[PDB]
């Protein structure tokens, strides 16, 4: 059993509904219970449902009870998580990972082994402030030449960013996104380079904003 | 329920030296089988979270060597025997008891190393940026350790306060150093009623502050 992937994730408005999907890849879920787990901004691990192989099991924390509700489908080999009546506090990134434990027919296994797979995560957003893709400002360099991308005024998180369609990767960092007073997020991303190369190097910052459908590049020059 | 909850909440280990994280849980972990329902992940910057040790003292197929547990009942331990650059993490201990599942704090574990100065650049603002009426001054710090740094603005040499906001990335897993922006933010009007913009840096590998300038505006 190799990888899981989390998808549905997105921006709601308080009250609103989204349904996560845990996909498996490599390994079928069926013989095994799942879990989600999220982790709230910049804050640890939080258990939130699970649900055993055959669905007879279906498990919440207290926080989710009554609002978000977990199924399973082995044709599709995919966990789902409904969330309904959705909160601000519900804002996290979601985590899907499997057991690898029997548990016989619920909470207990005596032959225990423990989550093994988990995914990368889905980012949950829940408010009330519309969705607003970034603009992009270079950052010119001025031996070893800085030089970088300002990506301001987003929301909701994530963006991503490359270099010179991840042709360029080393010497770079991207800065945590920050949330500004205005409630919107920014970031920089940066690089350092020959001072020699700037001449004859190209350097495009590649910046994707999923949530909006923007898709920006931006040629950084002296 | 079951409140798990570790200690110390933070660490900083030389690579090749030890280091070791408790956990402890409110109420017996210890089953009537004979085995204790604690287990150990870590979740790495940017990295699907890892299963490390499953019933306090297994250690789960892929895991290096150097990682093991200990313990029984409400207290127990994991234990690095020789730290490597790349265990830079947040580790957390979860009981497997009872529903609901439930974690300890997390534990972030920093790589100690020898004091590295950062590099200072300083960024004005793009003229692309200053049609949208807003300046962005950006002052970079590269590549440095430890992490704790001072980076104070000045605009004319006027001290600047509440107008900027500072980044700073995860340490880095193989050279164990951070970087850090700080971004002054100030309205068009205001940009170009100055001319002179520095941002002075503090830091413990620097002798004396670093300042990097710029005139315009």
């Known amino acids: 059993e190799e990888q899981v992937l989390e998808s549905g994730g997105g921006l709601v408005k308080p009250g609103g509904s989204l349904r996560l999907s845990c996909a498996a890849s490599?390994?079928?879920?069926?013989?095994?219970?799942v879990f989600w787990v999220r982790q709230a901004p910049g804050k640890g691990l939080e258990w939130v449902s699970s649900?055993?192989?055959?669905?007879?099991?279906?498990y919440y924390a207290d926080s989710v009870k009554g609002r978000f509700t977990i199924s399973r489908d082995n044709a599709e080999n995919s966990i789902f998580l409904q969330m309904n009546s959705l909160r601000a506090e519900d804002t996290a990134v979601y985590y899907c990972?499997?057991?690898?434990?029997?548990?016989?027919?619920?909470?207990?296994?005596?032959?225990?082994?423990?989550?093994?797979?988990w995914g990368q995560g889905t980012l949950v957003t829940v408010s009330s402030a519309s969705t607003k893709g970034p603009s992009v400002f270079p950052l010119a360099p001025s031996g070893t030449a800085a030089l970088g991308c300002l990506v301001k005024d987003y929301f909701p998180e994530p963006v991503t960013v490359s270099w010179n369609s991840g042709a360029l990767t080393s010497g770079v960092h991207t800065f945590p996104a920050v949330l500004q007073s205005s409630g919107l997020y920014s970031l920089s991303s940066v690089v350092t380079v020959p001072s020699s190369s700037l001449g004859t190097q190209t350097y495009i910052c590649n910046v994707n904003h999923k949530p909006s459908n923007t898709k920006v590049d931006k040629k950084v020059e002296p | 329920d079951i409140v798990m909850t570790q200690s110390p909440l933070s660490l900083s280990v030389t690579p090749g030296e030890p280091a070791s994280i408790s956990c402890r849980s409110s109420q017996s972990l210890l089953h009537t089988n004979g085995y204790n329902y604690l287990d150990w992940y870590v979740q790495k910057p940017g990295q699907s979270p890892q299963l490390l040790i499953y019933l306090a003292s297994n250690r789960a197929s892929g895991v290096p060597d150097r990682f093991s547990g200990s313990g029984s009942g409400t207290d127990f331990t994991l234990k690095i025997s020789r730290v490597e650059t790349e265990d830079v993490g947040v580790y957390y201990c979860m009981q497997a008891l009872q529903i609901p599942r439930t974690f300890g704090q997390g534990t972030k574990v920093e790589i100690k190393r020898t004091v590295a100065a950062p590099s200072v650049f300083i960024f004005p603002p793009s003229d692309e940026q200053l049609k949208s009426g807003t300046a962005s001054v950006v002052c970079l710090l590269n590549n440095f350790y430890p992490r704790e740094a001072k980076v104070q603005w000045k605009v004319d040499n006027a001290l600047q306060s509440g107008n900027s906001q500072e980044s700073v990335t995860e340490q880095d897993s193989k050279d164990s150093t951070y970087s850090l922006s700080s971004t002054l933010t100030l309205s068009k009007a205001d940009y170009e009623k100055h001319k002179v913009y520095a941002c002075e840096v503090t830091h413990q590998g620097l002798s004396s502050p670093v300042t990097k300038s710029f005139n315009r505006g």
């Open positions: 490599g390994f079928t879920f069926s013989p095994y219970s």
């Open positions: 649900i055993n192989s055959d669905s007879t099991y279906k």
């Open positions: 990972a499997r057991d690898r434990s029997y548990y016989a027919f619920g909470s207990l296994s005596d032959y225990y082994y423990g989550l093994d797979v």
